[PDB]
Amino acid sequence: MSYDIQAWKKQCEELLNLIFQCEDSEPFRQPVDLLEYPDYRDIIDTPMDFATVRETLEAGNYESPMELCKDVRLIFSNSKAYTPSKRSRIYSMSLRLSAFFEEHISSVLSDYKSALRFHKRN
Numbered sequence: 001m002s003y004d005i006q007a008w009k010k011q012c013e014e015l016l017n018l019i020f021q022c023e024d025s026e027p028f029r030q031p032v033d034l035l036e037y038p039d040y041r042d043i044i045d046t047p048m049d050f051a052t053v054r055e056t057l058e059a060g061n062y063e064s065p066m067e068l069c070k071d072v073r074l075i076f077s078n079s080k081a082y083t084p085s086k087r088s089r090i091y092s093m094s095l096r097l098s099a100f101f102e103e104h105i106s107s108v109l110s111d112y113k114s115a116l117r118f119h120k121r122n
Contacts, residue, residue, distance in 0.1 A: 003115040024097040
């Protein structure tokens with residue numbers, strides 16, 4: 001179990017469970033409704049949402065926690081592009097949940113890279 005290179009998957013499932021519980025995740029749980037928000041695709045090239053991230057992890061389509069972290073960061077960078085105004089309550093929600101995610105993902109990434117370095121050396 002020390003330096004287990006697969007432990008990040010369960011850690012990421014647990015973190016996504018916390019994120020889905022957070023009231024701040026409500027706008028980001030499901031894809032933006034493309035048929036009902038007509039100008040969304042005029043602004044955003046690559047939509048992303050937490051249900052898509054959770055399904056990608058479950059399907060085994062992330063090779064590392066860094067790939068999962070890239071998709072989650074796209075959720076927040078898309079929100080900042082579409083809702084850029086610091087006055088907006090949606091801007092505030094995105095910033096709070098981004099900080100929460102970045103705090104909790106830190107140890108998952110550091111542990112995973114430590115494990116990589118250990119198995120590569122040995």
